[PDB]
Write a protein that binds this ligand. Structure first.
Ligand code: CA
Ligand code: CA
Ligand code: CA
Lengths: 50, 105, 104, 50
């Protein structure tokens, strides 16, 4: 699932940077770099879980 | 309450009182945008950076900041045959008549 | 009361972005809020679709919902931040400040 | 001054036709009145043309 309280700040950080906006894939890896440790807990927020 | 999505909207011109100047078509599907615009805003639709930030603030304190709104982001035209104000018969393509995609703004 | 631009102060620390945004620490983004009922003022630049929806909403609000007050023009602002690769970047972000509102 | 129930249909008719969209600061001030016709008196206030 997508924890809104835990992922809201950092997920939005990657969106305004024009990342995590592709669909599965090209940007699937630059997106994971931006989320960092929160990749496991926030992949579902952008559907990049593979 | 589902999220922002395109929903049906049947437009009947006679119901609107436009049957006295619109010859054809007398009705068409225009669709409309309605739904919740809360985090996460789906990223594949490319929402504006402002909508992204506003949604974040709305998620931080919805009591203080209102959310973005579900509106049409891409509209297509339709052709209409009508009688203009000068009693001339005109077949024109009207722009921004049908909704093709919705998005939060 | 109707669709209009109102103030909205964005403080990055309040949002938890103080750990990667260096400057500015805050800026005015404004927001759009208000009613979208007939007559839609023509300066809002409403789409022909919005015009029809507003009419149907005025005839029978039970069956057709009204249009919504959203930004129609936006300007950018420059930001100095640290990307995910620890690089320092001074970039101009688009669609950051609201300049005009309109019913759509 | 603007009867919404009486002017909704005809006013919208002239708007989608791209009429009554100029400001008196005038060009379309006359083409707008032609479209409204008899409802000009009862609907001029709806577009601020009086
Ligand atoms: Ca982890
Ligand atoms: Ca009629
Ligand atoms: Ca943080």
């Amino acid at each position: 699932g997508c924890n809104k309280a835990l992922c809201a700040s950092d997920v939005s950080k990657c969106l305004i940077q024009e990342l995590c906006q592709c669909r599965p894939c090209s940007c699937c890896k630059e997106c994971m770099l931006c989320l960092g440790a929160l990749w496991d807990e926030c992949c579902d927020c952008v559907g990049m879980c593979n | 309450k589902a999220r922002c999505s395109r929903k049906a909207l049947h437009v009947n011109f006679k119901d609107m009182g436009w049957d006295d100047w619109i010859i054809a078509p007398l009705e068409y599907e225009a669709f409309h945008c309605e739904g919740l615009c809360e985090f996460p805003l789906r990223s594949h639709l490319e929402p504006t950076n402002h909508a992204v930030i506003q949604t974040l603030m709305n998620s931080m304190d919805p009591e203080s900041t209102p959310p973005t709104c579900c509106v049409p982001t891409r509209l297509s035209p339709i052709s209409i045959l009508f009688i203009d104000s000068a009693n001339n018969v005109v077949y024109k393509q009207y722009e921004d008549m049908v909704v093709e995609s919705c998005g939060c703004r």
